[PDB]
Design a protein around this ligand. Sequence first.
Ligand SMILES: C[N+](C)(C)CCOP(=O)(O)O
Ligand SMILES: C[N+](C)(C)CCOP(=O)(O)O
Ligand SMILES: C[N+](C)(C)CCOP(=O)(O)O
Ligand SMILES: C[N+](C)(C)CCOP(=O)(O)O
Ligand SMILES: C[N+](C)(C)CCOP(=O)(O)O
Ligand SMILES: [Ca+2]
Ligand SMILES: [Ca+2]
Ligand SMILES: [Ca+2]
Ligand SMILES: [Ca+2]
Ligand SMILES: [Ca+2]
Ligand SMILES: [Ca+2]
Ligand SMILES: [Ca+2]
Ligand SMILES: [Ca+2]
Ligand SMILES: [Ca+2]
Ligand SMILES: [Ca+2]
Lengths: 206, 206, 206, 206, 206
Amino acid sequence: QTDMSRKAFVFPKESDTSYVSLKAPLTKPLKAFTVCLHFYTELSSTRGYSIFSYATKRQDNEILIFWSKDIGYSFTVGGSEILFEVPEVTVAPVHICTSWESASGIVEFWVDGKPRVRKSLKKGYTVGAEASIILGQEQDSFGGNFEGSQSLVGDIGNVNMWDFVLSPDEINTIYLGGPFSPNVLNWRALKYEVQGEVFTKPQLWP
Amino acid sequence: QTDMSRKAFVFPKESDTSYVSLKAPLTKPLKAFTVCLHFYTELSSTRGYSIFSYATKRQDNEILIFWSKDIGYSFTVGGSEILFEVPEVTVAPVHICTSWESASGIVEFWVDGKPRVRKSLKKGYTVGAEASIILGQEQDSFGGNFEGSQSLVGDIGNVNMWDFVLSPDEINTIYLGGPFSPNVLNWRALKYEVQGEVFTKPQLWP
Amino acid sequence: QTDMSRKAFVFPKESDTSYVSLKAPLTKPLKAFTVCLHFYTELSSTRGYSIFSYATKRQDNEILIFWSKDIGYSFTVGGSEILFEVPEVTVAPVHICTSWESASGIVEFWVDGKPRVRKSLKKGYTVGAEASIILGQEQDSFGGNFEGSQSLVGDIGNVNMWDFVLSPDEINTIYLGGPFSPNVLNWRALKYEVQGEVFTKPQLWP
Amino acid sequence: QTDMSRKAFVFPKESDTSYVSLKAPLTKPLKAFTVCLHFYTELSSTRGYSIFSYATKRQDNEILIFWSKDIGYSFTVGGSEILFEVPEVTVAPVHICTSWESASGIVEFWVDGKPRVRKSLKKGYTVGAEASIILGQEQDSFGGNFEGSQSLVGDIGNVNMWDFVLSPDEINTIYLGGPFSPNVLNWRALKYEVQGEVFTKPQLWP
Amino acid sequence: QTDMSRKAFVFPKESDTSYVSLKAPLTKPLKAFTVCLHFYTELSSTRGYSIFSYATKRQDNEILIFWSKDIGYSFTVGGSEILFEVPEVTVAPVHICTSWESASGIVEFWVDGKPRVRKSLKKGYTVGAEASIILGQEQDSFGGNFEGSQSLVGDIGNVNMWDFVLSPDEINTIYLGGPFSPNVLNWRALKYEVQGEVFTKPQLWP
Ligand SMILES: C[N+](C)(C)CCOP(=O)(O)O
Ligand SMILES: C[N+](C)(C)CCOP(=O)(O)O
Ligand SMILES: C[N+](C)(C)CCOP(=O)(O)O
Ligand SMILES: C[N+](C)(C)CCOP(=O)(O)O
Ligand SMILES: C[N+](C)(C)CCOP(=O)(O)O
Ligand SMILES: [Ca+2]
Ligand SMILES: [Ca+2]
Ligand SMILES: [Ca+2]
Ligand SMILES: [Ca+2]
Ligand SMILES: [Ca+2]
Ligand SMILES: [Ca+2]
Ligand SMILES: [Ca+2]
Ligand SMILES: [Ca+2]
Ligand SMILES: [Ca+2]
Ligand SMILES: [Ca+2]
């Protein structure tokens, strides 16, 4: 396990072959989860890109967080999709947290510590545990078929994932960088592999 | 009685079928009242919705607080209506307090602790105490005929009601969340019934 | 004499019938004056209205403070007018102080403690002491002939008048609500009569 | 010599006839200077006006600071002109400092303590000491030929002039009103003559 | 060496002929570098200009930092170019740090302490040490062929250069003016030659 504190992955050129694969130790299906991350990119006015793609053998978009051009954030579970439209965007590092709960279908989406309205999505589903998690690309089969036009360019980091819904109070401590203990992906104890032009560099966000 | 402190009702999907009904202990007709609540919704740009609906067997819109598409807040007593127009809306949680006084007809409306101008409505009227209070829906009979196009989607909470007009100094401490004690409807001692898809979740507003 | 501190007059409906008349112990003619007041209205986009009207039996507009639609504040003395144009208006409570001096014709106008540029009006004139001061309406004759289309709707208060020009440092004290002593017309010792629908209510402004 | 501290000249009517003349004790020609002043006027959207006109027997615009409509500040030395364009202007009191140096032609212009970029003007020139300094008017002969369409309306004060270039760290203390001592023209010790409608009043700026 | 602390170069006229040449003691080629500088100019709306030009006898634009009209900052290494577009520009002093690393091609560009997204440029290249560094102009041959249409007008200073990539934490202390030690080019220990109309004056930025 590597402590990636103060470090970020950099995807400095558009590619369909550069990516990093994050390994989860998870062995029980997710009835709920939270994932939080920092990313920075200038693509937001140019094109859509995949922020965080989670796939399973049955389903290539089992969880996906995606920016869609002129729409805003797209969040999808089990291939069903909802939109958190953004009316205007500025170039700066952005923190997001998203969480979902099978027992209720409630999605929370948080941007820079400000909550979006809760929306229903894909109630009663279960997310598979046998998963391929990739940053930098959108994956259209388990671990592959990346499209260069959906790749991320820029930086991503502080990727943390929990198998439960963080409360609003906890999410505030994540945004402020307080102490917390992830249990699916932990940025302070990450297990990962890198392919192609990807670099680990000091983070640009404070 | 349930203490709903730090908790909110979530109406995560559009329907006419799901609502919450609040029970008042009141047994004397209201010569005056105050209502305060937090709500959060993205509908404000798409369509109108009912924020708080109070009906009596004679009159479905005995008190109604409503958002009118591209108009702003609509406040109506006894079926007579006035508008507090809003020229542009931010998407964030919003606190409102409203109050009315039969002896003068003066309405006050407060948005995020800022007072709107005082207006006149239904001087000399009285509001019935045999009442059905419903959240999430607009009702057109004593307890039903809900219109799905008027339902709320999003969150509501801190719904408090007083049988008297709060002063400007008190309303400020309501907004800042100081000590106070309602007497018609108390969020710390709520009586309610939930129908359909409604969830109680931690509040998103601070 | 009534201490109106923390209280305001409320004019909740458009009418020509409702007004309040303020009495001054004047005997010496006014070689100069200052008048300060708080008011709050939504009319500023809809139509003009009379903020403060001082009439004498020779002259209905002996002092007038008026809002002119799409123009801004109009200030008139002895029936002659100067405009303090406002390029864009916002709906909030607003404090104004205005002062005039016969020996120079210098008019000062202050809005929320921001001074407007000094202007010249009616140098060498004198304002009559045998005066009718009315709030809520525009006098077109001594004490009467009100025009409903010129009535104020909303709130007015902290009306204070001095028979001398307050210095900039004093006026800042008035705006911040420090200690001061009016000598023509004092809100802490007001003499008035109410006619029609006018109410005294707690002030909305701080 | 009069201490004008916290006083200002008021030019409340447009005219060609009213002005004040300031006398300098200077007896050696200026190889460099600084002049700082406060002024306040609403003309900025209506027309140009002379802020500070310095003339010598040979040259009526030996130093001139002039607002030019929809352009911004014009600064001229020896009849040669440069512009410091202002793209949008606001109604508030404004402090300017300007300074020039013969040995380099460097002009510095400062507005509310913010420096404009340094520019070159009339390197090697020499400003005459036999000077008529006039506030309120632009002058086209030594001490006369004023044009009413170039008069200032509003207020001017804190006019201070030095026969050397103030450093950036000094200019900041002029703007903040720290201790300083001019030597060509000193507001603490002014010699002046007033003609026509001009008044000395408490200053509007803090 | 000259300590240029709190001092800046002023280029007050457009010309082909005024420039300063800075001497680097470097004697090993650069696999990476950082350069930071302050500049101030009004040209940004009018035309492009060269902020910092590094040339070698093989290559006129070996490092170049350039502003291109209505595009934004251009940064080039080895004659290959990337853009950090600026959608709107403001007239104030601006501090930029830029850095590059051959081992990765990562470019970092920082404007007023805010990072732009990292980009890829000239991976595996090697910047020559036999170099001519010029301020005020762009050179198109080693030490010459300046074009007046590309000259800088205004101010430049605090030009510091390092033969390594500064971390994000170090770059913040550069921007805040903490203690630091450049090793290719040091503003506190500068060697330079001045040609034509260039002046050394106190800096306008704080
Ligand atoms: C978010 N999206 C709908 C644009 C893409 C979803 O994944 P995919 O269909 O491109 O593989
Ligand atoms: C006044 N209103 C537009 C908000 C609602 C009127 O129709 P209804 O909600 O009573 O059915
Ligand atoms: C002040 N005013 C110019 C707008 C109106 C004057 O006419 P009136 O209001 O006295 O009838
Ligand atoms: C050129 N100017 C408009 C800045 C000043 C004019 O001075 P003048 O030529 O009117 O006397
Ligand atoms: C390429 N540039 C436009 C940014 C700088 C100028 O290049 P060049 O004029 O030396 O050929
Ligand atoms: Ca996919
Ligand atoms: Ca895809
Ligand atoms: Ca109804
Ligand atoms: Ca209905
Ligand atoms: Ca009248
Ligand atoms: Ca009238
Ligand atoms: Ca002239
Ligand atoms: Ca002239
Ligand atoms: Ca070149
Ligand atoms: Ca060139």
